[PDB]
Amino acid sequence: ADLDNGEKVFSANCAACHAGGNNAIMPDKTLKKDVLEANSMNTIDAITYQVQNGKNAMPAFGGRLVDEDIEDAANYVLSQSEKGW
Ligand code: HEC
Numbered sequence: 001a002d003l004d005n006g007e008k009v010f011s012a013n014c015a016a017c018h019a020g021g022n023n024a025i026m027p028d029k030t031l032k033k034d035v036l037e038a039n040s041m042n043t044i045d046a047i048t049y050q051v052q053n054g055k056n057a058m059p060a061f062g063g064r065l066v067d068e069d070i071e072d073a074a075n076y077v078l079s080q081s082e083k084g085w
Pocket residue numbers: 010013014015016017018023025026028029030031035036039041047050051055056057058059061073074077
């Protein structure tokens with residue numbers, strides 16, 4: 001399952017800084033619905049690019065994660081965001 005796979009990817013790669021949809025480094029850049037909309041990060045392309053390319057203290061995962069995992073993770077974040085985390 002892509003959403004099921006996205007969760008596995010999230011756990012092994014994203015929870016270190018975003019467990020529960022938060023942001024352990026920059027408290028304002030969370031994965032919550034309203035913040036994601038405010039930052040224009042609520043679409044699949046925008047999130048997959050940020051994951052692939054990284055940004056500031058967030059690492060780039062293009063090298064390490066295969067394209068499918070980056071997508072499934074993006075979708076996982078979006079669904080969780082809409083369910084409230
Ligand atoms: C800590 C070492 C991080 C890891 C591992 C991941 N992310 Fe991250 N993310 C982190 C920071 C410090 C920031 C803010 C970057 C900046 O300078 O603005 C982010 C941001 C995001 C966002 C955008 C959130 C928003 O705009 O409110 C997303 C969608 C995001 N991060 C996703 C994400 C995913 C899915 C990860 C696993 C592949 C991931 N991040 C890991 C820090 C860290």
